[PDB]
């Protein structure tokens, strides 16, 4: 889920593009502090928001996670990424949650939609809103 101040695109950028630290424990603090819980796992794509927007321009395909959605797009090329996995839960004090980090080079499939009319910048009419899968 996302805090109310974010559009889906801004939340996608916060969860999957802006890895504030190369260390998962530190990077996850941002997502967890906003979600008010320690997310079990999360992937950070080491690419730019602009690159993902362009992936939104690739052919539409069925989303692996949902056979009823057709707003997904394949990255075409692989990108470096870091997958974070929760190793030490701490619902009472989320700042104490620790994560493992797994580096990899994989393709990704993202779901894209038209931007939030009132809050997303007009610069990008189409934006990524969900990371459906990494391969």
- 49 with 17: CB under 8 angstroms? yes
What residue ranges do the domains of the chain occupy?
1-135
Superfamily of domain 1-135: Ribonuclease A-like domain (3.10.130.10)
Residue 130 annotated to the active site: yes
CA geometry: angle 111, 114, 117, nearest 5 deg: 140
43 is in an annotated binding site: yes
Q: Which of 59, 87, 82, 83 is nearest to 72 (CA)?
A: 59
39 is in an annotated binding site: yes
Instruction: Compute CA distances 57 → 26, 50, 60, 76, 79, whole Å.
Output: 32, 11, 8, 11, 17
DSSP H or E segment with residue 11: helix 8-16
2 is in an annotated binding site: no
Identified catalytic residue from 16, 73, 74, 83: 16
Residue 16 annotated to the active site: yes
Identified catalytic residue from 73, 74, 83, 130: 130
Per the entry, the structure determination technique was X-ray
Q: Listing from the earlier edge strand, what are the strands of the sheet with 79-88?
A: 41-45, 79-88, 98-106
Q: Resolution to 1 decimal, in Å?
A: 1.2
71 is in an annotated binding site: no
């Amino acid at each position: 889920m996302k805090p109310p101040q974010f559009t889906w695109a801004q939340w996608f950028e916060t969860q999957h593009i802006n890895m504030t630290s190369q260390q998962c424990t530190n990077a996850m603090q941002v997502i967890n502090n906003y979600q008010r819980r320690c997310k079990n796992q999360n992937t950070f794509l080491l690419t730019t928001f602009a690159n993902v927007v362009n992936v939104c321009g690739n052919p539409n395909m069925t989303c692996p996670s949902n056979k009823t959605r057709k707003n997904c797009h394949h990255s075409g090329s692989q990108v470096p990424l870091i997958h974070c996995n929760l190793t030490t839960p701490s619902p009472q004090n989320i700042s104490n949650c620790r994560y493992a980090q797994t580096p990899a080079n994989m393709f990704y499939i993202v779901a894209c939609d038209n931007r939030d009319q009132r809050r997303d910048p007009p610069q990008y009419p189409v934006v990524p809103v969900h990371l459906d899968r990494i391969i």
